[PDB]
Amino acid sequence: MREVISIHVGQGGIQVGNACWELFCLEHGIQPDGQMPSDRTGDDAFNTFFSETGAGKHVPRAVFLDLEPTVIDEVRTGTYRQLFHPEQLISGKEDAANNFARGHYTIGKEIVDLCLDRIRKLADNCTGLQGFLVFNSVGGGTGSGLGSLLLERLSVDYGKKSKLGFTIYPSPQVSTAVVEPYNSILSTHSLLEHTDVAVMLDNEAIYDICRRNLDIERPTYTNLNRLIAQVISSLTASLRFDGALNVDITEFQTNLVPYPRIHFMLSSYAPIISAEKAYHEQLSVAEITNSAFEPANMMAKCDPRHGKYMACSMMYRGDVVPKDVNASIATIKTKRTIQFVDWCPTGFKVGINYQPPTVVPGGDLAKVMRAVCMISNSTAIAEVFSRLDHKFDLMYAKRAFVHWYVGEGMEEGEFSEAREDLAALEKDYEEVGIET
């Protein structure tokens, strides 16, 4: 009776939702056609993600948005053609061309109304709506712009419903576009006061994880999407599987957000081990939680050793026992390389689930009986904000590429106020981090 609605906007959001929904279908046993696996053989656990249509198949509680017809048309052609509602894969006619102003003032206005129609058409059906999940690529025009418009409209239309954001900021030095700081800072302004929880998913860190652990020297976007889907499944499995210590979606904001302004945080996962050397180690809960807190395993390119810890939420799925979790937490607390802020004596919220992680054919991970996904709030996140700020100031000093944004209806003063908002956001973190 509890439902979460996933919003996928932009090419990155679509391509991560593909893996997420493939993982969900495989984990719940639903065929790509949308049916139970043939005439070979319900626990009513699929209700969190799927809904019964009254005759046979299930329909995912998702909506796809894009202005580029290519990805959506190719999805429609693909083998998951019969799974989604035909009018849930909303597609545009012209791309925003990496322009935030286009997708926020010119093109996205003719599609946001239809998206709102579809989203309320999905929301009125569910009775126990837990919240919303949104996936978008920040370094993209239509992605950031449409995400901004959707968040702004959803806030006023719904009020107290929680929203979770899994954004992908540009990497510190490695990227694919040349104008991404602009729409990056603009979307940062848009989401700062509109999203309740933001989870950092920089690509460079995931490339590092793959190279170091999975021993893959030729990785593509598919591996990154599979890892993100595993993170999402580990986060959500408490809402649909029995466990010894349950945590609901409403029980994350109330434990990881000390103040309303500060809700930016990064995630981690463990174990991430290739099958060639996977279980030639014991994978006790102690070493998997040690690997999770290891700084090199951060899913975002940040060093927690450079700042204090605010709060930590970690969830174990498998055959863990609370006493072992307590022992591991005590060991981590006694460890000196990791330090917590003074006004937070206890900073761990633990959840336990008995559903072991599922494996996908053609994947890279190994079939574990134990796993842990940890999301932490720390003051060290400000380094990415600082390095992103420095990049923007270089181009903006010489009016570089500004005429492309001004000519699309955006006022000149937007950049200055966005810079001020980044400055204030940085203002918050260092002030709260210092000892009283």
Partner: protein, 71 residues
């Protein structure tokens, strides 16, 4: 959510099984099955090792024939 399993492995016992338990003598926390369970899990996981490595090798060979054909 629900707590329908006392632990990951052993389910809730039958009512006839708990004949006493008014006086604290049987706790079913002493396992009496830990060694055999973990020993079985060892080979259970070893089989997964072997399988996954097999599909992996198949994947690299399938990759290699492609570059051979292009050459």
């Amino acid at each position: 959510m629900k707590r329908v399993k006392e632990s990951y492995f052993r389910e809730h016992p039958h009512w006839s099984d708990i004949n006493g338990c008014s006086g604290a003598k049987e706790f079913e926390g002493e396992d009496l099955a830990y060694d055999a369970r973990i020993k079985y899990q060892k080979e259970t996981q070893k089989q997964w090792i072997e399988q996954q490595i097999r599909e992996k090798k198949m994947r690299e060979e399938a990759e290699r024939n492609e570059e051979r054909a292009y050459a």
